[PDB]
Symmetry: D3
C-alpha cells in the first residue's frame, strides 16, 4: 500500500479552449487563484494540453507580446507527460525531475481524473514520514538475488550462503 | 481515424530484471539485435522501466566502468514517459521531441501493450502521405471560433461575417 | 513610469537556517502555505539563498531520501539570481526566462526588500493592458538613429530624410 | 574579510548602443582587444546589457549572417545576471557556474561599477591560497548547531555534549 | 593495442544530397533499413553532414510538416562532430556522451572512412571483457608521478619512496 | 578559396600533464596570459585534451575546492571536439554553436597543428566582409536542382524552365 498518484492529485480542474486568448487565460487564472489550466480537447481523439503561469510569463510577458492577440494554443504544451493514477508518488516526483515539469495530468486511458503537482507532492505525500529510499532498496533486492544464486549453487548450509545474506543484513544496517 | 500509437507500436518486447548485470543486458541485446530492454517490474505496484543502448554507452562504456559488476537498475530510466495507446502518432512524435526521448512504452492503465520508437514513427507512420500540419490546423480552428462570434454579434448576412469566413478561406489556401 | 519590480514584489518573506532539516522546511511551508523560503544568511558578508518546493521534490522526494536527516543547505540555491528593485517587470520576466527561474529575491545593495515570482508577474503586472513589445520598440529606435544620420548626411529637406522617417512611420503602423 | 567582487572586477568598460551594427561591435572589440561590450542603456530606467565575442560567433558568424546589417540589440543579453559589489568571489564563481555565464556587470543599485569575468576570478582571486571549501564549512556549522541543541537538552557536562563537539572536531580534521 | 574507432566502424554508408526532400530521405531509409544518411558534400571544400531518423521525427513529424516540400538541408547537422580513425573506442563513447550524439562520421583528413554509432560500440567493442576504467587509471598514473618526485627528492631507499609506491599498490588493489 | 581553420588558428600552444595540480595550471595560465591549456597525451595512442579557465572556475573555484590537491585530469575535457585543418571558418563557428564550445584543437590525423577559438574567429575571420549566408546559399542550390529537373522534363525552351531559373534569380535578388 504505497501512496498513489490518485490519492494526492487535485480533482478540480479548470479548462480553456486553445483558441482563447492568453488574456482570457490570465483573466481566468487570477479570478480563480490558479497556476495551470487544462486545454480542453476539441474532440475525443485529441489529447489533453496544459498552459502554466510560467508558460505565460516566459513566452508572452518576457517579450512584451500582446496577450489579447495571442492564443492559448501558441503557448500550451500538447501533448503532455501524463501520470497514471496508480503510479507511486515517489515515482511521480522522479518523473517530474527527469522531465523538468512541475505538474502533469492524471489520466486513465484518455479520461482526465485530475492534476498532480509538486505542491501536491510536498503537502500531501508521505515522503517525510516514510522515505522510500529507492536506490538503497533496489541495491538490497539485488543482494537478495545474488544470495539466492549463491545459496542454490553452494547449498543453504554453506558459509558462502550465510555470507550472501549477511551482505543483505549489513546493507539493511546502514 | 488519425493513426494511433497502438497501430504502429512493436508488440514484441524483451525484458530483464533490475538486478541483472549490464553485461547480461549487453549479451541479451546483441543476441536478439535490440536497442532497448524493458526492465521487468518486481511486482504489480512497481512501474515499468527501460534501459537503452545509449544508456549503456553513455553511462558504462564512456567511463570504462565494468559491465559485469554494475546492475541494470543503476542505468535504467524508471519511471518513464509513457504513451497511451490512442495517442495520435503526430503527438507521440511531439512528445518525444519535447522530452528528448526516442522510445516509450505504450501502456493501458499499467499493462504494457508494446513499445513505440522513432523508427516505428519513421517507417510505419502516415506522416509523409498525410502531414497533419498541427499549428496551421489549430490557427484555422481559431479563425472559425472568431467567425462564429463575429457572425453571432453582427449577423450572418453582415459583410463582417462574410469576411471572417474569408479569413478561414485565405488561410485554407496557403 | 514603467512598472518596477518593487511595485509588484511580495514584501513578506519567511526564512530558515541552512542547518535546519528539509523536514523543518517542509513543515514550515505547509503550515504557512508557501512555495519558497529564504535561507537566512549566517552573517552580514554571507549572501541570501533560496529553497523551493521544486528543490525539495526534485532533490529529496524523487530519490526517496530522508528529509529528517538532510539539511536545507544541501538543496538550496546560494547565491541566487537577484533582481534590483527598479528593474522593469518586462525585464524581470525576461531574466526569469533566460535563467529558467521562477522567483528571485529583490535586493538593494545586500538588503532583502522582498521576493518577486512568476505569479507576481502574472497577477500584478500591466503586461496584459500595456504590452511593451520590446524587440519592436528596439527596432524602431534604430530606425530613428538611422534617420538622424541620413538627415544629417543628406539634409532635413532631402527625400532620403523624409523616407528614413517614413521607415519609422511604417514600422509604427504594424 | 573575504575577497569581494569589487576588489577584483575590471573598472574600465567600453560601451556601444543597441542600434549599432554587429560590424561596429566587431570593429570596436578588435581595435581594443576585447571580449565583451556593455550595451549602453538608452536612459535611466533602462537596464544594462552585454554582447560577447561568443554572442557574435554563435549568432552571426555561425549562420554566415551579415554583420553590417544586424544590430547589437538583436544579439545582446538584456537584462543580465548582475553581481552585487560585496558578493564574495567564491559565490560569484558559483553564480557563473549555476547560470553558465562567464562575465557579469557589477552593479550598485543601477549604477555600473565594472565587470567581473572568469579571468578576473582566475587571475586575481585568492582561491588557490585560501580555498573556502563551502559545503564542508556549511556541514561544520550544522554540526555546531546540533551540538548547541544537544548540550542545551542534556547539559554541557554530558558525554553527549562532549561527543557532539567531537563531531565538529572530527570533521575539522578531514 | 587498444581497440580503435576504425576497427569497429561501419564501412558502408548511404548518401543523399542536401536538396533532396525529407520524403526522399525517408523513402531511402525505409528501403535500406537505415537510421542515418550522410549528406553528400557538393564539392571538395564542403564538409560532410548527417541526417538521422530522430532529426526527421523531431523536426518534421512532430509538427506535421510536409516531408515532400522540406529539404534535407533544412534538418541535417553540418558540420558534425567527427571521430578520427585511431581514437580509442572508450574515448568515442565519451565523446558521444559529452556531446549527446549517437553517431559520427569517421574521417581521415576530410575523406570519409565510415560511420561509428552507439550500436557499433555496444556490439563490437571490448568494453565488457576489458573495462578500461579511465579515471582510476588516470588516478594511478598520478600516484606514479608523485612517487617519482618523492623518490627523487628523498631517495629510493627512503621509507617515503617505499610508501609512495605503496600508494600505487593500494589503488591497484581496489 | 573559402577561409580555412588552419589559416586563422593559433599555432603556439602551451601544455600540461594530466597529473599536474589545478594550481600548477592556474600558475601557468597567469604567467603566460592564457585561457586554455592542452593536456599532453601520455603516449601516441592517447587523445589530446583541454582544460579552460572556465573549467577551473566552474569546477574548482565555484565549490571552494583546493587547487593544490586536485589534478588537471579531474577537470579537463578528453577527448574533445576537434576541427580538421581545412574546415571553413563558417563551419567551425557553427560547430562551436552546436556543441557550446569556444575552442577546439586543430588536428591532422592525430597531430596537433594548433588551436582555434571564438576570438580567432572574431578577429581573423572574413565573416564581416564576406558573409557566406549558408542557409540562403543552400536554398538557392536547391532551386538550381529543381530547375535542372524541370528543364530536363519539359525542355529548355519551356516557360516552366524559364520560370524555374527565374526562381533562382528572384532568390538571388533578396
Amino acid at each position: 500500500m504505497v501512496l498513489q498518484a490518485q490519492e494526492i492529485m487535485t480533482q478540480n480542474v479548470v479548462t480553456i479552449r486553445g483558441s482563447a486568448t492568453v488574456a482570457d487565460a490570465v483573466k481566468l487564472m487570477k479570478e480563480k487563484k490558479l497556476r495551470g489550466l487544462i486545454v480542453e480537447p476539441r474532440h475525443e481523439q485529441d489529447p489533453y494540453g496544459i498552459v502554466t503561469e510560467t508558460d505565460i510569463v516566459y513566452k508572452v510577458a518576457a517579450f512584451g507580446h500582446d496577450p489579447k492577440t495571442m492564443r492559448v494554443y501558441e503557448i500550451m504544451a500538447k501533448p503532455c507527460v501524463v501520470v497514471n493514477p496508480e503510479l507511486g508518488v515517489e515515482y511521480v516526483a522522479r518523473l517530474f525531475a527527469q522531465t523538468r515539469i512541475r505538474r502533469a495530468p492524471v489520466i486513465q486511458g484518455k479520461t482526465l481524473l485530475g492534476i498532480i503537482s509538486v505542491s501536491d507532492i510536498l503537502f500531501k505525500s508521505d515522503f517525510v514520514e516514510k522515505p522510500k529510499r529507492l536506490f538503497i532498496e533496489d541495491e538490497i533486492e539485488a543482494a537478495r538475488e545474488d544470495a539466492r544464486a549463491i545459496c542454490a549453487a553452494k547449498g543453504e548450509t554453506s558459509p558462502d550462503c550465510a555470507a550472501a545474506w549477511d551482505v543483505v543484513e549489513e546493507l539493511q544496517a546502514e
